Amino acid sequence: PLGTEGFTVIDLPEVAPDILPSYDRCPVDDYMGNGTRFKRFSQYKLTPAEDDTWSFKRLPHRDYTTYKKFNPVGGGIRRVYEPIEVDFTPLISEGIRELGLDRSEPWQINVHQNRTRADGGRPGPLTPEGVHHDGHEFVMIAILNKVNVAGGTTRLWKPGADAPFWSGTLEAGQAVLLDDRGLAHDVTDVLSADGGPGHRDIVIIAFSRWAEKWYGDEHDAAALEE
Amino acid sequence: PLGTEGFTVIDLPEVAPDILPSYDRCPVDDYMGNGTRFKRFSQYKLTPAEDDTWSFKRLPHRDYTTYKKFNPVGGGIRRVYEPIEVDFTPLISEGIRELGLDRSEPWQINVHQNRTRADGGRPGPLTPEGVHHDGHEFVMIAILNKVNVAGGTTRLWKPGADAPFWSGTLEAGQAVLLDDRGLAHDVTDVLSADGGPGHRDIVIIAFSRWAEKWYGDEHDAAALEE
Numbered sequence: 245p246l247g248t249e250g251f252t253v254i255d256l257p258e259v260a261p262d263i264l265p266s267y268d269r270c271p272v273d274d275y276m277g278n279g280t281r282f283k284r285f286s287q288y289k290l291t292p293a294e295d296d297t298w299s300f301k302r303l304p305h306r307d308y309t310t311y312k313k314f315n316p317v318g319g320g321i322r323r324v325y326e327p328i329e330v331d332f333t334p335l336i337s338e339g340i341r342e343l344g345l346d347r348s349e350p351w352q353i354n355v356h357q358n359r360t361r362a363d364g365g366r367p368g369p370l371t372p373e374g375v376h377h378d379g380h381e382f383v384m385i386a387i388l389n390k391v392n393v394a395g396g397t398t399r400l401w402k403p404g405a406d407a408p409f410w411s412g413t414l415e416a417g418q419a420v421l422l423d424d425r426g427l428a429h430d431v432t433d434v435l436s437a438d439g440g441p442g443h444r445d446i447v448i449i450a451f452s453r454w455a456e457k458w459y460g461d462e463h464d465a466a467a468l469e470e
Numbered sequence: 471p472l473g474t475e476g477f478t479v480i481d482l483p484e485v486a487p488d489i490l491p492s493y494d495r496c497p498v499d500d501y502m503g504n505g506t507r508f509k510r511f512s513q514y515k516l517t518p519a520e521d522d523t524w525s526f527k528r529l530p531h532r533d534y535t536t537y538k539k540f541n542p543v544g545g546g547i548r549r550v551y552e553p554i555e556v557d558f559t560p561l562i563s564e565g566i567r568e569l570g571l572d573r574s575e576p577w578q579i580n581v582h583q584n585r586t587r588a589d590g591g592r593p594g595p596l597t598p599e600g601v602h603h604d605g606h607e608f609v610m611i612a613i614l615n616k617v618n619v620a621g622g623t624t625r626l627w628k629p630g631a632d633a634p635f636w637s638g639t640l641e642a643g644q645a646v647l648l649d650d651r652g653l654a655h656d657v658t659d660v661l662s663a664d665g666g667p668g669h670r671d672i673v674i675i676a677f678s679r680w681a682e683k684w685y686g687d688e689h690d691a692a693a694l695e696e
């Protein structure tokens with residue numbers, strides 16, 4: 245599973261040919277990134293299956309809701325996103341295998357398909373939350389494509405620390421897996437590499453046990469403080 | 471001068487008939503508020519003048535720049551805004567009078583003309599920076615108009631405190647004057663009062679001595695860290 249410090253970086257297998265083009269059809273994120281971000285969103289149930297396998301079931305499509313206490317800029321509100329068109333589950337399976345997800349109970353995942361654009365004079369913010377926890381138990385962040393960008397450096401932090409203990413610029417074909425409770429993270433802004441437009445296409449998977457799922461009326465009421 | 475706690479709330483006189491309608495002609499803020507905010511921006515020199523008066527001079531129009539250390543979500547970048555069309559200087563003068571602005575050197579002000587909209591299910595964020603200092607010496611925030619909104623409560627904080635020491639929802643015709651160094655501030659989101667659209671129109675005036683002005687090539691280089 246995860247390394248001693250609570251994170252691992254892995255290489256990803258080749259992706260299906262429809263995955264990278266699908267980022268061109270993600271609509272603008274109306275809630276984050278102030279026009280620099282484009283997004284689709286889907287949620288799944290993860291059930292340990294017969295054999296040492298995991299079965300994915302896409303859940304009925306719902307608005308994304310998170311807590312203000314984890315996300316001060318995009319928490320506490322209903323975030324209406326379009327569903328993800330492509331199938332990320334083979335890539336997610338790689339993260340499940342590296343995590344050694346506990347098979348004693350089922351899991352629920354949030355899947356964020358994000359493109360962030362940068363241009364000369366206008367960086368693309370990746371974590372306007374600042375140093376943060378996403379609020380889940382494990383998080384997988386996979387880089388699918390980068391074009392003409394600098395910056396975008398992932399930094400891992402122990403709670404309370406003045407500086408990160410690990411930093412690295414994740415490249416296309418890499419993913420980081422992290423203990424989202426024991427570590428916090430941020431990422432530096434995407435910059436234009438040459439003064440012209442550039443972009444960074446990623447998928448973020450947030451893992452929670454089904455018994456603490458981030459899905460349904462009860463979760464929504466808590467995140468929205470209703 | 472300001473109250474012993476570093477702030478004062480004042481009533482403003484009647485404003486010229488062109489002020490309130492001008493908020494309808496502010497374009498969207500491309501950089502903050504994720505489409506909920508609309509903005510114009512101008513900068514002035516304030517010079518002491520004969521007979522205990524102050525003279526205003528509108529400076530050549532430049533991009534707004536502020537520091538990431540003060541503004542985590544909109545700092546460190548060039549923010550291209552359009553100039554303010556109307557004349558806020560009589561209202562600003564009321565702030566100067568109540569501050570008892572030091573006449574021993576000239577001043578420079580940033581003037582932000584803001585409209586934030588709220589709607590059913592979509593609050594309008596007023597301080598996505600969180601609890602913050604704007605970075606200047608004094609700040610004046612004036613409410614010009616509020617239609618169909620709840621929330622929008624100003625909170626003043628002693629530096630590093632975990633709770634504000636003063637709270638109040640400023641209404642149309644009111645302004646707060648603040649020691650921007652000795653206190654920090656935030657404001658709760660504006661909410662739809664009844665489920666439909668509402669808006670809150672304000673002007674923010676940030677005061678710095680001319681010798682520390684937030685204007686020109688040197689300031690921009692420092693704020694952009696170049």
Ligand SMILES: N[C@@H](CCCC[N+](=O)[O-])C(=O)O
Pocket residue numbers: 276310315318354355356373378379380448450458
């Ligand atoms: N902080 C990201 C989401 C990261 C995943 C967290 N999750 O799914 O609760 C956002 O607000 O867009």
Ligand SMILES: N[C@@H](CCCC[N+](=O)[O-])C(=O)O
Pocket residue numbers: 515529530686
């Ligand atoms: N616009 C000037 C200051 C105000 C006028 C100076 N002046 O007399 O030409 C500046 O860029 O610093």
Ligand SMILES: N[C@@H](CCCC[N+](=O)[O-])C(=O)O
Pocket residue numbers: 502536541544580581582599604605674675676684
């Ligand atoms: N925090 C506000 C500006 C408040 C005035 C401060 N100033 O002029 O540097 C913004 O980023 O839009």
Ligand SMILES: O=C(O)CCC(=O)C(=O)O
Pocket residue numbers: 370371378385398429431446448
């Ligand atoms: O862009 C990234 O690498 C991760 C972003 C992230 O952690 C978030 O959006 O919560």
Ligand SMILES: O=C(O)CCC(=O)C(=O)O
Pocket residue numbers: 596597604611624655656657672674
């Ligand atoms: O909307 C307000 O009352 C104030 C905004 C503020 O403090 C800032 O924008 O720095």
Ligand SMILES: [Mn+2]
Pocket residue numbers: 376377378429
């Ligand atoms: Mn995150």
